[PDB]
Amino acid sequence: TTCCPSIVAKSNFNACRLPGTPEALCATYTGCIIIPGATCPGDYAN
């Protein structure tokens, strides 16, 4: 599950992922974090 600082960061993450780019790379590009649980904490953008 990808949990992002903001909707802008998550939009950038999703754009990175669209052509297949590995999740960890898109995470570092955006500031989004990856957690195994189904639910992001607090008010992070899923």
Curated annotation (Swiss-Prot):
A GO cellular component annotation in the UniProt record: extracellular region
InterPro entries linked to this entry: Thionin, Thionin-like_sf
Major site of localization recorded for this protein: secreted
Disulfide bond entries: C3-C40, C4-C32, C16-C26
Gene3D superfamilies linked: Thionin-like
Pfam families according to UniProt: Thionin
UniProt keyword terms in alphabetical order: Disulfide bond, Plant defense, Secreted
An annotated GO BP: defense response
Location in the cell: Secreted
Role noted for this protein: The function of this hydrophobic plant seed protein is not known.
Additional detail: Two isoforms exists, a major form PL (shown here) and a minor form SI.
UniProt similarity note: Belongs to the plant thionin (TC 1.C.44) family.
Protein's UniProt name: Crambin
Organism: Crambe hispanica subsp. abyssinica (Abyssinian kale)
Lineage: Eukaryota, Viridiplantae, Streptophyta, Embryophyta, Tracheophyta
